[PDB]
């Protein structure tokens, strides 16, 4: 943003938008994927108290 | 490297527009200059560098054109705006310029 | 004098106060190229060499 | 600007005239000047250059050997010289600027008045 | 790298680096899907034993 204007900073910014999302969708997958590991081991809890 | 002006006398009345041309034998840039010389003065020049006029020129003379083709454009002058035209160049040594073209009505 | 293109000059850069403005609206110039960074911002950010 | 050229008359064929312009405003230094003759009843065609010291002067058609311009900025004038003349070369004569050395010059142009020159 | 000089042979290998990445991607995601469903078969076989 301080070296370059609007017409040609946005080329640059789009290319760290594009990474940084798909960097934050990848972490979202693994935390869904995760989360459903440890719901079975507490469904396996609850049924052994 | 030699200017030429090809349009001959013309006969515009006060009004409407007149567009005059100006060549050249090889490939000149932003370096054409334009002069209006009435009967026994001195060439009052005209536009800078074929885009900007110089002080005292009103508005209504207006310079354009590129590459080897260059035009003069007069979009409604007056009642007594009619002489000699000339182009000239500062590329190169020496300044040629050229023929020149009257009007008459 | 300047030099020739086979052996071109090179002159470094110290503590200073550089200005870029002046420079640039003197309306002279056949090519004022900036590539990696805008013509207004020289102004204001600081460099290293 | 201002530019102010004297010298003229009548003449003879085959003598001399001091075609001299003044100038003052702008800096005559850094800054190239011409000549420029009109015979009364033509266009307009250029005579010859001088190139801000005199190193580099160059010449017009038949007018190489009869004319020799020279500039002096330490009395910020010029000259043509005029010398063994023809009479086929009465005309008026104008001194203007070519323009621009450095890169801080800031090209403007300005013509003269002129100067006429008569032969017999 | 044959028909292309380096200044236009990097535009057209990040298209290739791209399409790669998001498909090594959804292969790594897929499995980890598959796994998870292996996992709870197991778990059922180990207690059927």
Same mark, same amino acid.
């Given at each position: 943003?301080?070296?370059?204007?609007?017409?040609?900073?946005?080329?640059?910014?789009?290319?760290?938008?594009?990474?940084?999302?798909?960097?934050?969708?990848?972490?979202?997958?693994?935390?869904?994927?995760?989360?459903?590991?440890?719901?079975?081991?507490?469904?396996?809890?609850?049924?052994?108290? | 490297?030699?200017?030429?002006?090809?349009?001959?006398?013309?006969?515009?009345?006060?009004?409407?527009? @007149?567009?005059?041309?100006?060549? @050249?034998?090889?490939?000149?840039?932003?370096?054409?200059?334009?002069?209006?010389?009435?009967?026994?003065? @001195?060439?009052?020049?005209?536009?800078?560098?074929?885009?900007?006029?110089?002080?005292? +020129?009103?508005?209504?003379?207006?310079?354009?054109?590129?590459?080897?083709?260059?035009?003069?454009? +007069?979009?409604?002058?007056?009642?007594?705006?009619?002489?000699?035209?000339?182009?000239?160049?500062?590329?190169?040594?020496?300044?040629?310029?050229?023929?020149?073209?009257?009007?008459? +009505? | 004098?300047? %030099?020739?293109?086979? %052996?071109?000059?090179?002159?470094?850069?110290?503590?200073?106060? %550089?200005?870029?403005?002046?420079?640039? #609206?003197? %309306?002279?110039?056949?090519?004022?190229?900036?590539?990696?960074?805008?013509?207004?911002?020289? #102004?204001?950010?600081?460099?290293? #060499? | 600007?201002?530019?102010? &050229?004297?010298?003229?008359?009548?003449?003879?064929?085959?003598?001399?005239?001091?075609?001299?312009?003044?100038?003052?405003?702008?800096?005559?230094?850094?800054?190239?000047?011409?000549?420029?003759?009109?015979?009364?009843?033509?266009?307009?065609?250029?005579?010859?250059?001088?190139?801000?010291?005199?190193?580099?002067?160059?010449?017009?058609?038949?007018?190489?050997?009869?004319?020799?311009?020279?500039?002096?900025?330490?009395?910020?004038?010029?000259?043509?010289?005029?010398?063994?003349?023809?009479? &086929?070369?009465?005309?008026?004569?104008?001194?203007?600027?070519?323009?621009?050395?450095?890169?801080?010059?800031?090209?403007?142009?300005?013509?003269?008045?002129?100067?006429?020159?008569?032969?017999?």
């Amino acid at each position: 943003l301080s070296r370059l204007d609007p017409p040609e900073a946005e080329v640059q910014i789009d290319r760290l938008i594009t990474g940084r999302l798909q960097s934050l969708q990848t972490y979202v997958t693994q935390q869904l994927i995760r989360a459903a590991e440890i719901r079975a081991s507490a469904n396996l809890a609850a049924t052994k108290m | 490297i030699r200017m030429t002006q090809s349009p001959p006398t013309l006969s515009l009345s006060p009004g409407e527009r @007149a567009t005059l041309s100006c060549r @050249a034998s090889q490939s000149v840039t932003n370096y054409l200059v334009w002069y209006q010389q009435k009967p026994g003065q @001195a060439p009052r020049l005209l536009i800078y560098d074929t885009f900007n006029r110089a002080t005292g +020129i009103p508005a209504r003379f207006s310079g354009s054109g590129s590459g080897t083709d260059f035009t003069l454009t +007069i979009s409604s002058l007056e009642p007594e705006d009619f002489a000699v035209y000339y182009c000239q160049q500062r590329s190169n040594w020496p300044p040629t310029f050229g023929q020149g073209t009257k009007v008459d +009505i | 004098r300047f %030099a020739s293109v086979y %052996a071109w000059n090179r002159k470094r850069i110290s503590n200073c106060v %550089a200005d870029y403005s002046v420079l640039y #609206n003197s %309306a002279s110039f056949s090519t004022f190229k900036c590539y990696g960074v805008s013509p207004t911002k020289l #102004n204001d950010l600081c460099f290293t #060499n | 600007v201002q530019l102010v &050229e004297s010298g003229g008359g009548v003449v003879q064929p085959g003598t001399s005239l001091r075609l001299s312009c003044a100038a003052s405003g702008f800096s005559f230094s850094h800054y190239v000047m011409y000549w420029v003759r009109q015979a009364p009843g033509k266009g307009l065609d250029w005579v010859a250059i001088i190139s801000f010291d005199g190193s580099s002067q160059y010449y017009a058609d038949s007018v190489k050997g009869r004319f020799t311009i020279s500039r002096d900025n330490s009395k910020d004038t010029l000259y043509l010289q005029m010398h063994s003349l023809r009479p &086929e070369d009465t005309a008026v004569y104008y001194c203007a600027i070519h323009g621009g050395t450095y890169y801080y010059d800031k090209n403007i142009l300005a013509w003269g008045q002129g100067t006429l020159v008569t032969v017999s």
